[PDB]
Amino acid sequence: VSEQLKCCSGILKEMFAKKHAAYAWPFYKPVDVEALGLHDYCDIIKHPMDMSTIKSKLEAREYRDAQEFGADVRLMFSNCYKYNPPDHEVVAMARKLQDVFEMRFAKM
Amino acid sequence: PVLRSVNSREPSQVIFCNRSPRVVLPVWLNFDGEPQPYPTLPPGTGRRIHSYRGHLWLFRDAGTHDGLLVNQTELFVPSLNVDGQPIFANITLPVYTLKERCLQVVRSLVKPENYRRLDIVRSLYEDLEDHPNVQKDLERLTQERIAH
Amino acid sequence: MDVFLMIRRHKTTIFTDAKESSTVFELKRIVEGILKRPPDEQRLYKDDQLLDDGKTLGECGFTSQTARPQAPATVGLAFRADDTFEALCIEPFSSPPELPDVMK
Amino acid sequence: SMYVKLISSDGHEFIVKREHALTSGTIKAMLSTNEVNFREIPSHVLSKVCMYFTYKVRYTNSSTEIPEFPIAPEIALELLMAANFLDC
Numbered sequence A: 001v002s003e004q005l006k007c008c009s010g011i012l013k014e015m016f017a018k019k020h021a022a023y024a025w026p027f028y029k030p031v032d033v034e035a036l037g038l039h040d041y042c043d044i045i046k047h048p049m050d051m052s053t054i055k056s057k058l059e060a061r062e063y064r065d066a067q068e069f070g071a072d073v074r075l076m077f078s079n080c081y082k083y084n085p086p087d088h089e090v091v092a093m094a095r096k097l098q099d100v101f102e103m104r105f106a107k108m
Numbered sequence B: 001p002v003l004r005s006v007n008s009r010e011p012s013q014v015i016f017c018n019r020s021p022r023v024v025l026p027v028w029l030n031f032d033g034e035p036q037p038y039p040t041l042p043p044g045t046g047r048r049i050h051s052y053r054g055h056l057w058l059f060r061d062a063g064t065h066d067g068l069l070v071n072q073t074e075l076f077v078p079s080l081n082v083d084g085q086p087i088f089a090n091i092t093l094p095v096y097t098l099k100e101r102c103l104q105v106v107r108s109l110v111k112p113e114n115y116r117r118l119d120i121v122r123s124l125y126e127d128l129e130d131h132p133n134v135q136k137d138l139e140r141l142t143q144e145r146i147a148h
Numbered sequence C: 001m002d003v004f005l006m007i008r009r010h011k012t013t014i015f016t017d018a019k020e021s022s023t024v025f026e027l028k029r030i031v032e033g034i035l036k037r038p039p040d041e042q043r044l045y046k047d048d049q050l051l052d053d054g055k056t057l058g059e060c061g062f063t064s065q066t067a068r069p070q071a072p073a074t075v076g077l078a079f080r081a082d083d084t085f086e087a088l089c090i091e092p093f094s095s096p097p098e099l100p101d102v103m104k
Numbered sequence D: 001s002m003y004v005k006l007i008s009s010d011g012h013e014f015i016v017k018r019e020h021a022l023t024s025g026t027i028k029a030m031l032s033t034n035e036v037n038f039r040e041i042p043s044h045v046l047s048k049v050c051m052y053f054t055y056k057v058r059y060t061n062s063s064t065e066i067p068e069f070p071i072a073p074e075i076a077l078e079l080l081m082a083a084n085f086l087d088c
């Protein structure tokens, strides 16, 4: 079980890597509703999530297991899929980052 | 056009600080040089802004339609933020000429169809109608950048 | 900081600057250089309250907040009439006309 | 250093600094006693103009926040006409 969380932190480490920076930068920090001028975001997204928020909970040992870690990762992507139309640029970057997550999360 | 933003797609965090007593209208110059308005800023308020490196920005008074200063100059360009340090854009009031400052007061108290009704020289009727705008200030800026 | 004043005696108004630390006497040196009248022939007033040469402009009530360039604070001035000092008389400025109909 | 006397139409004398008065192009066109007499500018308008001279010299090339120059609606037309005639 501790093997899982160690591998989970390693998966998130690569997600922060520069090789994925071209499309993973909008999800590094929490959604800045003030900076983006988003008024309806907090109304539509009942639970926001980003990559740094995962890092703090992972280092704070708040994830009971790996499945709980993946739920926040999936929650982070879906919020982008729920709020943004499918043709927008940010949805395309969220899919290309989720492909990085799904391919290693499957190979535990 | 010459004054335009570069399509760098490189993000950079910027803070818009309104140190002016009026509502500030931030204007962004796109990649074709055209001015595009952005949400306004109440006086004495600041907010984080997501922009990109090499983009043009100019700020306008929402009441007097006159231009405002940003970091003691007319134009603002976000640089690549270093060490994750935020870039500040202090929007302050300029030192208008007394004539232009007087025009700001007379325009705000008289409907444009009553300018000629006022008892002043006819040369001031034209100046009252010569309302400030981004287009006019952009033409003057480009001429200076064209010859230099 | 710096204060901005309006020294008024009758129909003469002087727009000068000084400091909260500068004394009332140093202000008389300024009036001495402009009007060719030594300090002992001058009395500085502040709306009917006489000012003493040993006090600073800040202690008199002139503040950086209340003596701004766009709205300077007025300083009364009276001159010695040979024998004695004249009464402080500050002639008021003209009055604006009635506001136009189409204004406001 | 040097001061200049600006006389209004109703006999009011306004002594300001030479550099400050030169903000007016009209006054600059007249000067190098050293005094300028305006027969069409009253005292309450010429006083407000001398305040603008101090306001301009102080906050030009300034790095602080610049305050708005106050203008009463009852003198907006008269102050505009003086500003247009003085080129300041």
Ligand SMILES: Cc1ncsc1-c1ccc([C@@H]2CCCCCCNC(=O)C[C@@H]3N=C(c4ccc(cc4)OCCCCCC(=O)N[C@@H](C(C)(C)C)C(=O)N4C[C@H](O)C[C@H]4C(=O)N2)c2c(sc(C)c2C)-n2c(C)nnc23)cc1
Residues within 6 Å of the ligand: A025, A026, A027, A030, A031, A032, A034, A035, A036, A037, A038, A079, A080, A083, A084, A089, A090, B007, B008, B009, B010, B016, B026, B028, B038, B039, B040, B041, B047, B049, B050, B051, B052, B055
């Ligand atoms: C309130 C206020 N008061 C006074 S001024 C002001 C203000 C208002 C708005 C903005 C606006 C705000 C920005 C997105 C507004 C749309 C509404 N949807 C949303 O924000 C939903 C939101 N999507 C994104 C996102 C990410 C990447 C994208 C597209 C979307 O792909 C573009 C990559 C290359 C583009 C280069 C360019 O030059 N791009 C240009 C143009 C050509 C217009 C597109 C550009 O963007 N420019 C020009 C000038 O530099 C200003 C700036 C701008 O327009 N910024 C993000 C996140 S989290 C996060 C950190 C980001 C970033 N995320 C998540 C997880 N889920 N969803 C979302 C800025 C200031």
Ligand SMILES: [Cl-]
Residues within 6 Å of the ligand: A034
């Ligand atoms: Cl905040």
Ligand SMILES: [Cl-]
Residues within 6 Å of the ligand: A100
């Ligand atoms: Cl990869």
Ligand SMILES: [Cl-]
Residues within 6 Å of the ligand: B007
């Ligand atoms: Cl683009």
Ligand SMILES: [Cl-]
Residues within 6 Å of the ligand: B053, B079, B080
């Ligand atoms: Cl740069």
Ligand SMILES: [Cl-]
Residues within 6 Å of the ligand: C084, C085
């Ligand atoms: Cl006596």
